[PDB]
Amino acid sequence: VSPLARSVDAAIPEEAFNQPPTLTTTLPNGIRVATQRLPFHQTATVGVWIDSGSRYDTKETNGAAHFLEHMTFKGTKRRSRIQLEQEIENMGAHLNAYTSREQTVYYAKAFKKDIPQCVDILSDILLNSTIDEEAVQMEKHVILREMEEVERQTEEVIFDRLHTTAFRDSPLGYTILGPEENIRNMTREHILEYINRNYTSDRMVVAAAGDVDHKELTALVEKHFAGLPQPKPTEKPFFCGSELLHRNDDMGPTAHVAVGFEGVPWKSPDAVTFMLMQAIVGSYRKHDEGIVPGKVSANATVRNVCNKMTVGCADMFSAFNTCYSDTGLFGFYAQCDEVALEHCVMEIMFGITSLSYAVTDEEVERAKAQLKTQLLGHLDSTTAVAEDIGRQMLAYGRRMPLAEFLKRLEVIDAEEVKRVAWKYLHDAEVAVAGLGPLFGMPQLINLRRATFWLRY
């Protein structure tokens, strides 16, 4: 009757369904090609995504994966280093690469007419690089300086040490750079052994996005990657509950901390719920805040942190969720004052423990809104789309279209969150890492007994 009950209702807009298709094809040797064409763009992105990283080093040569990333730009059988660099630059293009624990990525940006050349170049440097010993013995300088700098970026060292203390028994523990003595001892044969054990056709996919045609890309891949060799049980990584604390009173008043829980794999049904829980806890910065004061925010965790002792007890905090092929991590990172550390940490643990007892649908819907804004807001440019194509191709064997993600996200309510949390996070093991003025720091047993409430 009343007009206030006549409002338009569209949970999922029509645009979520009216999206261009993602085209897929597998070549005889096992290489997979994926594409999506976007009419509203002039350029394109094309690259290679490889299912290998530092998790596939051996403990004796830990650090070879990352060394190969440098070696591939040093020269090939067809072109010298000067020739290679000038043929990067004279296109007026971009070329990027990086490696991680489980994945390695190379890609370029160009106008359509130069996609062939790009493919060629990519193939070359992936298949035909000359790993000269008298160049390996020089890249050690640059890699050692790179490590030197990396030790100064505190967030990354904290996360590395969290992985170190959480996965003691597994190659997930390994850092990407590798120890110092390994950087000094690295040898051509180690790098070539890594190549000839991991660069097989089943592990590579080629993706593009922008102004691209699937047929020509498939033909180009068939033309250039004909030389890639073809291929010829494992068990779940164990998660250890331990702490690793570096006490230091000569680096100023601020303490850094990270806490972690055991997660779920990429393909797990509950993965989406985990993506949502990360958003329900969210983040905060005291320096830069948007337009909502923390003391009145809709997020209860931020609100509780900002009202502590009337002054508020944190400089920054942010939650995170990371999924791997067979396991995950779930947790948070924080920065706070020496004397605030205790509250700084226990407030957020109370946060995360609430997910299993008392969360309500106002909060769930706020978190859905913010999560959708974030994720759907990134996928604008060709690079983001190509990265998403390749990432999903490796993680799932497919690409999941937007409508599917939205439909699966819609039907999660509070009781479902309160079920999954009760399944994985209530009364669990946790791993801890920290740096700085840690006199305040809580005990490991405190953090572990925090995961349940005696009330209720």
């Binding site: 209530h426 009364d427 349940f452 409430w453 005696l454 009330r455 209720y456």
Partner: protein, 92 residues
Amino acid sequence: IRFGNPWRDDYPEWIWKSLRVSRKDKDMFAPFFKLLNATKLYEYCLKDNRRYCMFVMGVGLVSSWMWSEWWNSVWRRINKGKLYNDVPYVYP
């Protein structure tokens, strides 16, 4: 004499050796823990503190009484023919 002597005290070599022995990555009671974990007592009765309290109270209630009656029976078994019931009085 090395024992209790500040001029000479040190461990015997066999005590120094007992500390070198190792049982890493071995466990001999795993079958018992597997059995207990299979009963799923934790999932249903001990993972939630309200149920933890219910369990404590009820198991108390029943166990106390069983223990009591068992000790009663023992007290009658050891003292047979000494207690009042076992030897009736016969009137003159």
